Amino acid sequence: ALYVLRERIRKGLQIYQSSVQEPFLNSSNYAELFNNDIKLFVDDTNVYRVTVHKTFEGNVATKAINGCIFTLNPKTGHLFLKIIHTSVWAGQKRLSQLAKWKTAEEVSALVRSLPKEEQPK
RNA sequence: AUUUGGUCAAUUUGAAUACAGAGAUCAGCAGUUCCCCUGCAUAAGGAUGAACCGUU
């Protein structure tokens, strides 16, 4: 009830919590992806992969493999796959955070490489 | 120095019920006009091709 009241108050005032300013890609605006404007999907999910090898049964075996930064142009179908080598992560700490930064850097580099015409919106 | 700018509406009444008052948001497509291209028709108007002789 209290929460509801708070919400109502907010509405009245038109205060809102940050969230994110940019508009989310969604089922609603999925069709927006395939207009003439140039775009690039980026994925940092595969940058620091650890592996714990597991078969159909699930037997244990430890290792830490190479990663990648999947960066895809859905118009042209190009895939600027920056392969992150495992040597990067040797003697490092706060690893996940570092990975994100690395990914960002890579993206920036890619952008720089692309000319003004081919660059993404 | 005092005070007016402060009456919820709606319903049931002969004060009670109500309690602020009753589709939103996102997205297609077609039409309307003008333009451009393309194919066809209609008129008109060209331009040109095609062996070899014809008809009382």
Question: What's CA A37's distance to the chain center, in Å?
Answer: 20
In single-letter form, the type of residue at position A114 comes to L
Q: Measured in angstroms, what separates residue A116's CA from nucleotide B52's C1'?
A: 72
Q: Measured in angstroms, what separates residue A46's CA from nucleotide B24's C1'?
A: 41
Residue A66 buriedness (CB in 10 A; 0-12 / 13-18 / 19+) = middle
Shortest CA–C1' contact from A27: which nucleotide?
A: B26
Residue A80 buriedness (CB in 10 A; 0-12 / 13-18 / 19+) = middle
Report which residue is nearest nucleotide B27 when distances run from CA to C1'. A28
Residues A42-64 as b or e (16 or more Cβ within 10 Å = b): eebebbbeeeeeeeeeeeeeeee
| Phi/psi of residue A68, nearest 5 degrees | -155, 160
Experimental method: cryo-EM
Q: Which two tokens stand for residue A62?
A: 């430890």
Asked if the Cβ of residue A51 lies within 7 A of any atom of strand B, the reply is: no
